[PDB]
Design a protein around this ligand. Structure first.
Ligand SMILES: Nc1ncnc2c1ncn2[C@@H]1O[C@H](COP(=O)(O)OP(=O)(O)NP(=O)(O)O)[C@@H](O)[C@H]1O
Lengths: 123, 355
């Protein structure tokens, strides 16, 4: 069994307890992430190495290197009988609009599949 | 056959949208009060092609999560009983309008609106294209829009991936259908080269449409379409003219005086320098000379909005095997039912939140 801990800003943490398994897929994380973070879209998440350096996972592949490191980290811990830390991941904050530095659009009256049109409305 | 029984999770408010393969309606999730679109697809297994197209639509939309691609929030579980389950209900983000309604209105659409709409469109596409998915019918009405100018790509029933091994070209064109106005030369000419570039011809048409606020190539039938294009682009070089696969349209291509391109600066006289430069890079006969959505995102015209970190690829590519071309109608119903179940079965409150 593996526990992933999701750090969520100004809230707390979510602990995801995996199956097992196999196999953990990058999507399985993204899907859990978006499920605990419903008001956002998250394409990516980081995690820390021994140095405390964030390393980003954008896909499978890099998923495999996270699992490799964390499994090493797990081995060493209760060999020394230490308390086993969950794998902690930091979802990469993605911009909402956000992107739109400015402006709006009217939707009350459309009509209207025009060409030079469109002849209709209402309100 | 439009009657919505969604009952008790959702309350139906009017009807917004119509087409084939379904009818859409505004709705409000009862207890939360969250506003959604609900799209009913009446008797969705009754016809093998509509069946595939439906399964195709669910799998594609489940795969994506992107702010520029329309998202399935829910898919209603079969109501009581199975009883030869017929109509499929899918819940989506409620979008107020669409780009066609925006482009054609007495409402102002500034250069800045075209920049931001074009950016968001290209964003979602970079994403979809890296999944190895070609939309294949991209037109202003398929691009949903709201008051804040969020743009989201819809209508994935025409999307196909691949192309596969040398087959199927030819049968790449079945079933499909699309307006010739946004249709790409390789789809018109059976050029035996079908890539994500297909969509980028459509973008150029949409881009040009937004600048002039009128359709760029509104052909009244096949050769007229072929002609309207050739007016501005000139005639296709011998290499493409010889790359034509049928009819022979190659004949009548071989005919006609060789024409010359018209600079986009005359076809859009009063138009932004940069916009035209990017528009030019998208509209080209040969699919391989067409700029990619990924590279178009880096064009100076979009420089204001460009964010390398905010423009994701789609992590695993979409897998289009499951292609149903014969693949009996019942087994298709099974798979559509196989989704919707999995969709719900992937929650799984499997987690705990620290207090
Ligand atoms: N999520 C939505 N929010 C608001 N309006 C929508 C939404 N989805 C669809 N519509 C509108 O309803 C229409 C029909 O939905 P649509 O999915 O395009 O049907 P369909 O299976 O594509 N039929 P077609 O357009 O002929 O291929 C769309 O053209 C939209 O204009």
């Amino acid at each position: 069994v593996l526990v992933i801990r999701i750090k969520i800003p100004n809230s707390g943490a979510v602990d995801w307890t995996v199956h097992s398994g196999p196999q953990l897929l990058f999507r399985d994380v993204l899907d859990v992430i978006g499920q605990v973070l419903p008001e956002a879209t998250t394409t990516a998440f980081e995690y820390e190495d021994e140095d405390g350096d964030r390393i980003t996972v954008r896909s499978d592949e890099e998923m495999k290197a996270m699992l490799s490191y964390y499994y090493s980290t797990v081995m060493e811990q209760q060999v020394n009988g230490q308390l086993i830390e969950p794998l902690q991941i930091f979802p990469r904050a993605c911009k909402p609009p956000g992107e739109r530095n400015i402006h709006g659009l009217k939707v009350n009256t459309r009509a209207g599949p025009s060409q030079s049109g469109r002849h209709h409305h209402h309100h | 056959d439009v009657t919505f029984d969604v009952g008790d999770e959702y309350e139906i408010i009017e009807t917004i949208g119509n087409g084939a393969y379904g009818v859409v309606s505004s709705a409000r999730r009862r207890l939360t009060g969250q506003q959604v679109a609900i799209k009913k697809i009446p008797n969705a297994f009754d016809v093998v092609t509509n069946a595939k197209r439906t399964l195709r639509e669910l799998k594609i939309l489940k795969h994506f999560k992107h702010d520029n691609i329309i998202a399935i929030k829910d898919i209603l579980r079969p109501t009581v009983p199975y009883g030869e389950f017929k109509s499929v209900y899918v819940v989506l983000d409620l979008m107020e309008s669409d780009l066609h309604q925006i482009i054609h209105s007495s409402q102002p659409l500034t250069l800045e609106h075209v920049r931001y709409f074009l950016y968001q469109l290209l964003r979602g596409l970079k994403y979809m294209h890296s999944a190895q998915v070609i939309h294949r019918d991209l037109k202003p009405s398929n691009l949903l829009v709201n008051e804040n100018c969020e743009l989201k790509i819809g209508d994935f029933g025409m999307a196909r991936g691949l192309c596969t091994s040398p087959a199927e070209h030819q049968y790449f064109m079945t079933e499909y259908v699309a307006t010739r106005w946004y249709r790409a030369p390789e789809l018109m000419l059976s050029l035996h080269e079908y890539t994500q570039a297909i969509d980028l011809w459509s973008v150029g048409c949409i881009f040009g449409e937004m600048l002039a606020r009128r359709q760029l190539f509104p052909g009244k039938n096949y050769v007229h379409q072929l002609q309207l294009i050739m007016m501005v682009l000139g005639t296709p070089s011998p290499a493409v003219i010889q790359a034509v696969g049928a009819e022979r349209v190659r004949a009548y291509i071989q005919s006609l005086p060789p024409r010359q391109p018209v600079p986009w600066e005359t076809v859009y006289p009063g138009a932004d320098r940069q916009a035209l430069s990017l528009l030019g890079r998208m509209l080209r006969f040969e699919p391989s000379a067409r700029i990619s959505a990924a590279a178009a995102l880096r064009h100076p015209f979009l420089a204001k909005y460009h964010d390398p970190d905010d423009e994701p690829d789609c992590a695993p590519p979409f897998d289009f095997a499951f292609d149903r071309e014969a693949l009996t109608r019942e087994r298709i119903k099974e798979a559509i039912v196989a989704e919707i179940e999995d969709f719900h079965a992937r929650r799984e409150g499997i987690r705990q939140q620290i207090r």
